[PDB]
């Protein structure tokens, strides 16, 4: 019956019936996340357990048409998404074993305490107990106690549980046609569509390693200035001048973001940053003028207005009833034309540069709403947060803030306070690029069998001195599981979608600040009142997953691959300032000195 036509019939019936079931299963979650109770907790589960049965029936139906006969494009791009079964390919008892392991690891990570040697009755949880010791303190031994305690308490319990999860998820991803569980995660970046826009799974491994060698003459200048500023605080006997940084002195439990080192490594500590929170609270900005002035931005660059029910259905402030909401900003797309934002807004310049983020999410969600059901997302996993973060880059410049009278009109842009801003940006952006590359490389190598079971703790600290440039303060052996002390490793989350979206939101901004006729440095660009840079952003937002990400990137930028040259064009004055400041210092490190010896 001309198998493409049977696939067209099946996809038409699925698109008809899959809209009333996916709206109930999202309204039952909106009615829980803003009104946390027990009856809502029951309704959310009993309405989200019909959608999973319907979707699994759809997947078992769709695993009947062989995709080497369907000669269309959007009727072959949907059968291949519906044939991606997932964990439900296992035997009916190994699935319960996998659920047991994957829930036990999450509970072990969640209920994690460290009890001190002075008073053993006094114990501290991670949030909010240990992430004030490991974010405020400048004491060596206290930070070493917290770091070694968290590692020795949540690594020895998660080492024998991370060795069954590897064996089961190398079977889940082996009964689906992939080679290991690294390929099952890397196959979000695949494309075998029309011509010249083909991307293999195994090109991502070399594209990431090709982009990192461009961001590593700048990280070696950052990790020769941060090291000097730490030497000026802790002392020359604890921190060397040609070795790596010890791991616990990074302003974080895992050393992911270096943002808490800004109190120590600030270039000019007499010139303060711009803060309009006093000017917002002394001009009577409520929690609704923020969202109505973050909409005159999108209507000025050329995008859409919000809907009519968005203003009466959303939760734009924390309620004063007996509702106990969870205060964490999310932007919902519930289904049949309603878009809602949940956020507990207060008057600061941190809920002002989050209204633009959460509105850039639903301005993406409002644009691909003609695409069927499965083709409604970003082109890969890093596209949906790269367009939410090119709005916060232009909603914070000292010209967009000066056009709203949140700044004094006789401003002077204060030459030192652009290096004081670029360093605060760099400690967050370039500080995490070796970490999200090294952790994902270690995971891809232990999933495919390139790192055997007897050398996980050895190869982790062998790679953390060659990539990140961070040494360990305590000798570790093969009973620890130091990677599993992170949230995204214990809760089974992919982690390259934070590396391949710090690269996309400078390829986006270098194109949108070329279309808006901007002559100057890139870190003070402004897509405001510019419809030419909103008519080519709308060519990207319109697609969904109907086009592969290479073509959707060529339509905006002009080059269908990743590139780190716009990141180095953003951090261009900081690099020239750092090369003057690091005059006569050893750029780089030698991986042989250790603080324990």
């Amino acid at each position: 019956q001309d198998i493409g036509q049977q696939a067209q019939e099946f996809l038409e019936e699925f698109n008809r019936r899959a809209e009333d079931i996916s709206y109930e299963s999202s309204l039952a979650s909106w009615n829980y996340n803003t009104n946390i109770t027990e009856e809502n907790a029951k309704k959310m589960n009993e309405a989200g357990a019909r959608w999973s049965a319907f979707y699994d029936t759809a997947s078992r139906n769709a695993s009947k048409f062989p995709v080497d006969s369907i000669e269309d494009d959007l009727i072959k791009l949907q059968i291949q998404i519906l044939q991606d079964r997932g964990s439900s390919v296992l035997t009916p008892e190994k699935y319960n074993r996998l659920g047991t392991v994957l829930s036990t690891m999450s509970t072990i990570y969640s209920t994690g305490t460290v009890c001190k040697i002075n008073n053993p009755s006094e114990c501290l949880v991670l949030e909010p107990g240990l992430d004030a010791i490991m974010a405020d303190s400048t004491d060596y031994h206290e930070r070493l106690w917290a770091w070694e305690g968290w590692r020795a308490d949540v690594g020895r319990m998660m080492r024998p549980l991370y060795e069954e999860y590897v064996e089961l998820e190398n079977e889940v991803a082996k009964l689906n046609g992939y080679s290991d569980y690294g390929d099952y995660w890397r196959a979000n970046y695949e494309a075998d569509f029309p011509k010249g826009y083909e991307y293999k799974r195994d090109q991502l491994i070399e594209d990431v390693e090709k982009t990192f060698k461009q961001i590593k003459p700048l990280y070696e200048q950052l990790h020769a200035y941060v090291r000097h500023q730490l030497e000026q605080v802790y002392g020359p006997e604890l921190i060397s001048s040609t070795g790596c940084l010890p791991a616990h002195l990074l302003g974080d439990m895992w050393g992911r973001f270096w943002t808490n080192l800004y109190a120590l490594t600030v270039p000019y500590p007499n010139k303060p940053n711009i803060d309009v929170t006093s000017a917002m609270v002394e001009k009577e900005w409520d929690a609704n003028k923020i969202f109505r002035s973050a909409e005159a931005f999108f209507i000025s660059i050329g995008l859409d207005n919000m809907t009519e029910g968005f203003w009466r259905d959303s939760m734009l402030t924390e309620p004063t009833d007996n509702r106990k909401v969870v205060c964490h900003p999310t932007a919902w797309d519930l289904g049949k034309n309603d878009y809602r934002i949940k956020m507990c807004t207060k008057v600061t310049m941190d809920d002002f540069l989050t209204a633009h983020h959460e509105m850039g999410h639903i301005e993406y969600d409002m644009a691909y709403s003609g695409q069927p059901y499965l083709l409604r997302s970003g082109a890969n996993e890093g596209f949906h947060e790269a367009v939410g973060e090119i709005m916060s880059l232009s909603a914070a410049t000292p010209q967009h803030l000066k056009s709203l009278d949140l700044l004094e009109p006789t401003f002077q842009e204060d030459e030192e306070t652009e290096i004081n801003f670029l360093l605060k940006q760099a400690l967050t952006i370039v500080g995490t690029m070796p970490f999200t590359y090294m952790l994902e490389k270690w995971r891809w190598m232990v999933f495919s069998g390139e790192i055997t079971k007897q050398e996980w703790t050895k190869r982790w600290w062998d790679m953390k001195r060659e990539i990140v440039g961070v040494v360990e303060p305590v000798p570790h052996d093969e009973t620890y599981c130091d990677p599993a002390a992170l949230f995204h490793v214990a809760n089974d989350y992919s982690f390259i979608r934070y590396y391949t979206r710090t690269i996309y939101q400078f390829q986006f901004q270098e194109a949108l600040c070329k279309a808006a006729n901007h002559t100057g440095p890139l870190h003070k660009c402004d897509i405001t009142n510019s419809t030419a840079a909103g008519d080519r952003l709308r060519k990207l937002l319109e697609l969904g997953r109907s086009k592969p990400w290479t073509e959707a990137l060529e339509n905006v930028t002009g080059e269908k691959y990743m590139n780190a040259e716009p990141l180095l064009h953003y951090f261009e004055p900081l690099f020239e300032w750092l090369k003057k400041a690091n005059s006569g210092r050893f750029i780089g490190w030698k991986t042989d000195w250790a603080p324990y010896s």
């Binding site: 067209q8 038409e12 009333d20 709206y23 009727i75 029910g309 049949k336 034309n337 695409q371």
Partner: protein, 199 residues
């Protein structure tokens, strides 16, 4: 000649915006100051005609549409605001002299009864395997999903599929007094002008 009485505008329940009722009058003596004295007029935005010289001209046809419409969403009926109103419910004709009134119906008007909710439509499309095919409105015409939406909406975003087409409603309750909307449009005659005012 005779009276074009506005009795169907002043009785029953005014319908929602998609199912708007039309009251084209001809060959009578009219008095719009009789009509607009009964309401609390909140807007008189006109196009290619003036509100002072509308009430006494001689024309050939006189078209009045009316529906129940809250006056807080008065920025969605304006031209050049491509929302969910002018795309699916009602798109005003502009190639003719027209006006637009938004009233605030008083409680001393006892003959007009009150509905339970305001309502409009958020989408009206035609499903397939390649996605949604939207059916936008034509200027001055009803929506193509009219026979589908005439079953009643009970909750927000309740849809109604029938074969090809698929419409979707949205309701919200009425607070205070009732508010309507009158889209009055005329046409200048060429041979006989029978729509001349009451003097």
């Amino acid at each position: 000649t005779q009276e074009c009485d506005f009795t169907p505008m002043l009785t029953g329940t005014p319908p929602p915006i998609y199912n708007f009722k039309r009251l084209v009058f001809t060959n009578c003596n009219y008095n719009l100051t009789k009509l607009l004295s009964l309401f609390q007029v909140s807007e008189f935005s006109c196009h290619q005609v003036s509100p002072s010289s509308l009430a006494t001209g001689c024309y050939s046809s006189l078209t009045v549409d009316y529906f129940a419409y809250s006056t807080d969403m008065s920025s969605y009926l304006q031209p050049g605001s491509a929302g969910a109103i002018v795309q699916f419910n009602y798109k005003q004709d502009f190639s003719n002299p027209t006006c637009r009134v938004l009233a605030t119906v008083p409680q001393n008007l006892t003959t007009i009864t009150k509905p339970s909710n305001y309502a409009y439509l958020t989408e009206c499309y035609k499903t397939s395997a390649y996605g949604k095919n939207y059916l936008y409105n034509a200027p001055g015409a009803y929506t193509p999903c009219l026979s589908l939406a005439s079953r009643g909406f009970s909750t927000k975003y309740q849809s109604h599929s029938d074969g090809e087409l698929t419409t979707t409603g949205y309701i919200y309750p009425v607070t205070g007094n009732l508010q309507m909307a009158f889209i009055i449009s005329v046409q200048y005659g060429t041979d006989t002008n029978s729509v001349c005012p009451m003097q």
